[PDB]
RNA sequence: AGGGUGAAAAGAACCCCCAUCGGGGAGUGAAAUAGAACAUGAAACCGUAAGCUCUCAAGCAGUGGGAGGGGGACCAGACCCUGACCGCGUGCCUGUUGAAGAAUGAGCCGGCGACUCAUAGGCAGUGGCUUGGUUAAGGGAACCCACCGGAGCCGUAGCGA
RNA sequence: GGCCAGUGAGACGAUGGGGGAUAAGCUUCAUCGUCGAGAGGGAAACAGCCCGGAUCACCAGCUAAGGCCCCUAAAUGACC
RNA sequence: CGGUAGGGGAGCGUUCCGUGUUAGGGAGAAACGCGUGCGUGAGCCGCGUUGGACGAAGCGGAAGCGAGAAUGUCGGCUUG
């Protein structure tokens, strides 16, 4: 059955993918079965990372002040800390504001004496 | 100042002078002012910390800069046992902040 | 691309040659001619005449010297192939291709640029 | 009396529409 | 197997290199980055040039975080392109209770390639009419397949051999 | 009640019984759950075991199972 | 609001035709890039370059309606 003729119709449906594989190392952005397995890798692992993003940091921020509790006094753990806050009343200092850890380390000094007065 | 605004799930600690692109803000107009008085940590020399939920006193002010999607981001998943492949995309205001004042 | 001349339907080929050219890149009219020919390669021609070619006219048709002339682009494509058949074990396992070369160079004035200068008092 | 700025706006047929779904 | 340079070919004198094969200029034409492989001429494939990464680092190798470098920014406001390194991480499809594979099909690309059509019947949506509804053949001065034709079929009473 | 289906060689774990030596992710039935037509977290890596069962975004918190010397976040915390 | 086979409910695009020698085009289709804005998505709109001719907005109608695998078919082109 002489069909309508894909022509450029099949023609876009294969350039669009090529398009997308424009910062790939491997030879998976020169063909549509190379790239194929590839958008699929780009089409799960993305559907991944993005929820991931958020664990992807959860072990940071912790990371964070872990290294930055073996040095100042109470080596047991900054869960104690986080204890202290939470029995105490501040809602802020978040795993994201963790950040007075690295800069300005004179604010996070601060409430390293506030979580033992507390607790 | 180092505060701590409440986006509505988000807390960043949005250092004056920079842009934060926050959720929906059906309260807020294109180019309006808003006002957060949730603001947890406060700079003023020593970090402050307040008792009782958010502060009692003062407040962060700024105007946010028009509300857009900004880029469809455009997430999507995919499946092996069965062909299944969709695309969808997110809009997200992202309406970002500014604010200036700045201190210890 | 200033003079671009040689040709097409060589009967050399793309693998063997180019090894030839390659080495003439970069290089004088003259550093160029005095190395092909003693290149034990069949490659060396019509080559030869191509280095000769894309030169001499270019100093009468434009205004560029003998010297300073230096091959700036060179790059051997393949051309048209005849598939060939040529008889072994019941004819099966044939295809056979002739991949023909038609490089295309091009010659052009070097830059650079020396001014010396020093004190002599007397 | 028609708007002269290129773009009539009559009222003929235009489509038949549809006819039940399906 | 193999289609068409252009409107008319004026389809390329002469000049230069070569073995008086081939090419480049000079000219013709609105175009020859249209000239006899010639129109528009993508992809697979095959190269040059430029920026970045690249010898102590390994596993379908992308992705998330992410320094530096070559450029482009705004009379800071920390962004747009490449990417060291790092956390995870065994193609697709088919067939199966179950595989990433030692399960199988596929070298790549362009085109091409698999539930359409006729008649009839039973439903669903919808439309005209209505216990009525509706024709088939045929005729037709037919901008026209209308009109006429209701021969015939279906339904409102059934049940029983 | 009516229109269109699909599927009839499924597997595994717990529990209650036939086959085998109460030997097998073996085979043949009943019941529940999972896989098979739902990821992910945990058991190093093991679909079927455990927790929980994914509209989506988010440098947002708290938990389940399983853990908390380092390697991948988390007690070489206290008492016997 | 995980989802296979399946069932049901909504749409895009392609060739052609009716509504079109109306309108857009030599101050110019087609082929490639880009604006990475827009829609749930397949895509659409605008535009630069190249290039050479027509093509076609909206609704509906009629389709031989878009495949990277059936040891596919034809042609061209890699690798050893």
Same mark, same amino acid.
Request: charged content about 30%.
């Given at each position: 059955?002489?069909?309508?003729?894909?022509?450029?119709?099949?023609?876009?449906?294969?350039?669009?993918?090529?398009?997308?594989?424009?910062?790939?190392?491997?030879?998976?952005? #020169?063909?549509? #079965?190379?790239?194929? *397995?590839?958008?699929?890798?780009?089409?799960?692992?993305?559907?991944?990372?993005?929820?991931? *993003?958020?664990? $992807?940091? #959860?072990?940071?921020?912790?990371?964070?002040?872990?290294?930055?509790?073996?040095?100042?006094?109470?080596?047991?753990?900054?869960?104690?800390?986080?204890? $202290?806050?939470?029995?105490? *009343?501040?809602?802020?200092?978040?795993?994201?504001?963790? *950040?007075?850890?690295?800069?300005?380390?004179?604010?996070?000094?601060?409430?390293?004496?506030?979580?033992?007065?507390?607790? | 100042?180092?505060?701590?605004?409440?986006?509505?799930?988000?807390?960043?600690?949005?250092?004056?002078? +920079?842009?934060?692109?926050?959720?929906?803000?059906?309260?807020? @107009?294109?180019?309006?002012?808003?006002?957060? /008085?949730?603001?947890?940590?406060?700079?003023?020399?020593?970090? @402050?910390?307040?008792?009782?939920?958010?502060?009692? /006193?003062?407040?962060?002010?700024?105007?946010?800069?028009?509300?857009?999607?900004?880029?469809?981001?455009?997430?999507?998943?995919?499946?092996?046992?069965?062909?299944?492949?969709?695309?969808?995309?997110? +809009?997200?205001?992202?309406? +970002?902040?500014?604010? @200036?004042?700045?201190?210890? | 691309?200033?003079?671009?001349?040689?040709?097409?339907?060589?009967?050399?080929?793309?693998?063997?040659?180019? %090894?030839?050219?390659?080495?003439?890149?970069?290089?004088?009219?003259?550093?160029?001619?005095?190395?092909?020919?003693?290149?034990?390669?069949?490659?060396?021609?019509?080559? =030869?005449?191509?280095?000769?070619?894309?030169?001499?006219?270019?100093?009468?048709?434009?205004? =560029?010297?003998?010297?300073?002339?230096?091959?700036?682009?060179?790059?051997?494509?393949?051309?048209?192939?005849?598939?060939?058949?040529?008889?072994?074990? %019941?004819? %099966?396992?044939?295809?056979?291709?002739?991949?023909?070369?038609?490089?295309?160079?091009?010659? %052009?004035?070097?830059?650079? =640029?020396?001014?010396?200068?020093?004190?002599?008092?007397? | 009396?028609?708007?002269?700025?290129?773009?009539?706006?009559?009222?003929?047929? !235009?489509?038949? !529409?549809?006819?039940?779904?399906?």
């Amino acid at each position: 059955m002489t069909r309508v003729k894909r022509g450029y119709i099949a023609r876009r449906r294969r350039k669009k993918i090529r398009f997308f594989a424009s910062s790939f190392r491997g030879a998976h952005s #020169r063909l549509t #079965r190379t790239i194929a *397995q590839q958008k699929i890798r780009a089409l799960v692992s993305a559907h991944r990372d993005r929820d991931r *993003q958020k664990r $992807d940091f #959860r072990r940071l921020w912790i990371t964070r002040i872990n290294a930055a509790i073996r040095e100042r006094g109470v080596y047991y753990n900054y869960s104690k800390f986080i204890h $202290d806050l939470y029995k105490r *009343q501040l809602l802020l200092n978040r795993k994201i504001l963790a *950040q007075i850890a690295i800069l300005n380390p004179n604010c996070i000094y601060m409430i390293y004496n506030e979580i033992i007065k507390k607790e | 100042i180092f505060a701590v605004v409440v986006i509505g799930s988000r807390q960043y600690i949005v250092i004056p002078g +920079r842009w934060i692109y926050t959720q929906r803000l059906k309260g807020a @107009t294109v180019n309006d002012k808003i006002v957060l /008085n949730k603001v947890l940590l406060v700079g003023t020399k020593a970090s @402050t910390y307040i008792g009782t939920p958010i502060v009692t /006193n003062a407040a962060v002010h700024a105007v946010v800069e028009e509300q857009l999607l900004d880029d469809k981001v455009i997430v999507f998943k995919y499946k092996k046992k069965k062909n299944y492949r969709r695309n969808i995309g997110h +809009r997200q205001p992202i309406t +970002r902040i500014k604010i @200036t004042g700045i201190t210890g | 691309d200033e003079i671009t001349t040689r040709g097409y339907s060589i009967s050399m080929s793309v693998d063997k040659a180019r %090894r030839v050219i390659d080495q003439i890149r970069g290089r004088s009219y003259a550093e160029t001619l005095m190395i092909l020919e003693l290149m034990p390669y069949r490659a060396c021609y019509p080559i =030869f005449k191509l280095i000769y070619s894309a030169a001499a006219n270019a100093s009468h048709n434009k205004q =560029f010297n003998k010297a300073n002339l230096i091959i700036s682009k060179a790059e051997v494509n393949k051309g048209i192939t005849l598939k060939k058949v040529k008889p072994r074990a %019941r004819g %099966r396992s044939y295809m056979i291709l002739r991949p023909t070369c038609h490089i295309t160079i091009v010659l %052009r004035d070097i830059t650079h =640029f020396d001014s010396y200068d020093k004190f002599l008092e007397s | 009396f028609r708007l002269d700025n290129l773009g009539p706006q009559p009222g003929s047929r !235009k489509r038949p !529409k549809r006819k039940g779904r399906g």
